[PDB]
């Protein structure tokens, strides 16, 4: 008979796992809680949920599990099924699904002094409020709140986990280099841990692990921003096309359709939260409105181009403003049978001259919109992405 079997029989002769280990009535059990992150699996912005793979480093003391190793062949510690011993109901209160408890249920390590250590593994899906502004140039701040579901501050005292040596406490999420998978979409800037209390109830206390993660904006630049920049370039180019070629409407309306399609296909990536509008959606809407106004002004230019003295009479103010002022500023500086047929050609020539004046106004107006749209598109696009690049997580996590 091995001595470990005898020690286990002695320890659990009258042990009750349902009783909190308070040696005297009124004592509190101090529970050290720490977190080790092995993989930040997913951050689903559609359902606002962060799923991660973690180890819960739990430590406490159970005075009932004490023995003299000299009397048991020098057994200094044991590994026991976790259901055989009392454990604090340290659960994640921030979970998005119904899973409060850990998954793996590894053995607890019990030392001869009564120090019980437990490091269960879990796949945790916690609730994270996504700050949709600045998406996809944003940092998120997702919290994992751990506390005993049943025992309150009068029964258990939550503390931070100690280091690999017992010299000092760890106030951060531990990352094991040998067992950590870096997420390809997020970079962890801060991983602090802090104990939290609530006023108006001196019985609440939790340990919150904060993950401040900055999104790497690639796969969004190259798949939304660049094509939309190209479409905006086409929209600017619309005003350089001559009205004499039936391609103004095709180009402008196809650009608008492409931007709308990109917006629709991006609608399944952004969250449905209506607190604010993400910056990429704002840029898409700005481009959509710009291309719509490009279509409107191309329609106006085509209307002006086909006007005729037989159809319209040129207002004095329009001729004055456009023909006089604009081109300097925009650099756009320019036997009776025989008698009848001569006058007929003469009548057409003066009629043709007035037709060209309408075509000149359209050409002058087209150039003005070409420069105006280019300035608005360039400044507007640069401004949107100027402050997008300035959104960075703070140096102080604030814990």
């Amino acid at each position: 008979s091995v001595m470990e079997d005898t020690l286990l029989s002695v320890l659990f002769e009258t042990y009750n796992p349902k009783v909190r280990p308070a040696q005297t009535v009124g004592d509190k059990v101090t529970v050290r809680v720490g977190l080790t992150l092995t993989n930040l699996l997913i951050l689903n912005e559609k359902i606002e949920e962060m799923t991660t793979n973690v180890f819960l480093n739990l430590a406490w003391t159970d005075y009932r599990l004490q023995w003299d190793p000299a009397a048991y062949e020098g057994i200094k510690d044991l590994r026991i099924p976790s259901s055989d011993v009392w454990q604090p109901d340290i659960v994640l209160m921030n979970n998005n699904d119904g899973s409060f408890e850990i998954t793996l249920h590894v053995n607890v390590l019990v030392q001869h002094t009564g120090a019980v250590s437990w490091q269960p593994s879990a796949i945790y899906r916690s609730s994270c409020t996504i700050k949709v502004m600045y998406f996809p140039f944003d940092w998120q701040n997702c919290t994992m709140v751990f506390k005993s579901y049943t025992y309150d501050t009068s029964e258990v005292t939550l503390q931070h986990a100690l280091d690999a040596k017992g010299e000092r406490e760890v106030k951060e999420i531990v990352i094991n280099k040998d067992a950590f998978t870096e997420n390809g979409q997020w970079s962890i800037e801060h991983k602090p841990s802090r104990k939290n209390w609530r006023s108006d109830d001196p019985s609440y206390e939790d340990v919150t692990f904060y993950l401040i993660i900055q999104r790497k904006p690639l796969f969004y630049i190259v798949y939304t921003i660049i094509p939309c920049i190209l479409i905006s370039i086409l929209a600017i180019l619309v005003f350089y096309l001559p009205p004499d070629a039936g391609e103004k409407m095709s180009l402008s309306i196809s650009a608008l359709l492409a931007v709308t399609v990109f917006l629709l296909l991006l609608a399944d990536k952004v969250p449905e939260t209506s607190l604010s509008v993400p910056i990429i959606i704002r840029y898409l809407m700005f481009i959509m409105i710009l291309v719509a106004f490009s279509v409107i002004l191309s329609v106006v230019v085509l209307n002006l181009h086909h006007r005729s003295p037989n159809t319209h009479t040129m207002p004095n103010w329009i001729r004055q403003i456009f023909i006089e002022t604009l081109p300097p500023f925009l650099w756009i500086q320019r036997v009776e049978a025989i008698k009848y047929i001569a006058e007929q050609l003469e009548s057409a020539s003066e009629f043709d001259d007035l037709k060209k004046d309408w075509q000149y106004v359209a050409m002058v107006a087209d150039r003005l919109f070409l420069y105006v749209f280019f300035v608005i598109c360039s400044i507007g696009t640069f401004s949107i992405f100027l402050d997008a690049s300035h959104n960075v997580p703070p140096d102080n996590p604030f814990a």
């Binding site: 009258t14 009750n16 349902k18 009783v19 909190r20 280990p21 308070a22 009535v25 359902i47 109901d89 998005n96 119904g98 409060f100 609730s127 409020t129 579901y149 049943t150 025992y151 029964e155 009205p243 039936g246 409407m249 095709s250 309306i253 196809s254 608008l256 359709l257 709308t260 399609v261 629709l264 609608a267 449905e272 939260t273 209506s274 607190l275 604010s276 509008v277 959606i281 809407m285 959509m288 409105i289 719509a292 279509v295 409107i296 329609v299 106006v300 085509l302 209307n303 086909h306 006007r307 037989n310 159809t311 319209h312 009479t313 207002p315 049978a337 025989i338 009848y340 047929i341 007929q344």
Partner: protein, 390 residues
Amino acid sequence: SEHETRLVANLLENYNKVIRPVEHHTHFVDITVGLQLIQLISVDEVNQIVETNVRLRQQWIDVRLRWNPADYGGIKKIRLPSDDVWLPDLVLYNNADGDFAIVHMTKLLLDYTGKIMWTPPAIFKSYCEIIVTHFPFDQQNCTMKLGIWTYDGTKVSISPESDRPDLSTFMESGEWVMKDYRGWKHWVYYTCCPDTPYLDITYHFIMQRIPLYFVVNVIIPCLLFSFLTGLVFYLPTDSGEKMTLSISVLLSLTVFLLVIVELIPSTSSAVPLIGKYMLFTMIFVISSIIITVVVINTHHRSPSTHTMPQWVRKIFIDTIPNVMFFSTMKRSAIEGVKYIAEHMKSDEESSNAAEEWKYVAMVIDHILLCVFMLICIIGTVSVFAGRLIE
């Protein structure tokens, strides 16, 4: 704790959890029931299911679980697994996808007087008959009915903890705003058991939708394309591509119709306002395209083949142009020479009659441009504002 271990041994020795905690079988178990809403997980309108995160606070006295604190070192409260004691069988009546009762079975607090407080968590996925009339400026009234399911009011009577569900630790949705919430207790006689009443508590939530997401992502493009439908009448028919613009807008509205159809449930109880707007815009585009084809046919009417009716010439050349002031509308050698003069004379007459049809066509365009822009704004600004007025 040795005292607590001995107490737990004593309490559960001769305790049967199958049996109700009443001194006499004619008594009823009075259970205080409260609901704490922690988070509104989601409101699936297509499947008409609202899933929420809740805590189901339940308080009742168990006379078999009382002890004298002086006999156990002064212990006044303990924690017990809920699987060890009799529990109420609270059931969510309107369960759509999930558990009718509690399945987590957390621990409960038991004090020396026998009083028990049990606060298990739950994810309630209940059926919500969503009203799709004013989507997305709608408010939904979603409810949760909780009952005992096996005992009448004379056995396991339940009463609400407070007139309203507890939202003290409720986290803001960001997609919905809780306009109101309240719980009501009902005595119901079912066709199973008409002799005695069964007690239930129904907690209802009236939640207003925050429409910023749907407005930006759906409504604004629809407005832009409707405005483009209106704009199509300022495009000259001599340039062509009127059909290009009308068709492109029509295709965009078809795609948005598909997108909106993917969002709302297929129930026919009421027609969504967004669906009414989509149908109105579709009819608007169809009418614009028909009128555009009429205008194009009028512009290309042959002078020789088609002679302009006197009435239409009168109206569309004398009356309508003068009505509107904002527009710029206007209000052998010898025989060979005799042959070319006759040819140019006939061509001049043909040209004058040709431009007459073109002039009439653009007069109709100006009339239809004013009409279509006017009806467009009153079809959206005055119509959408009915719900926005509230």
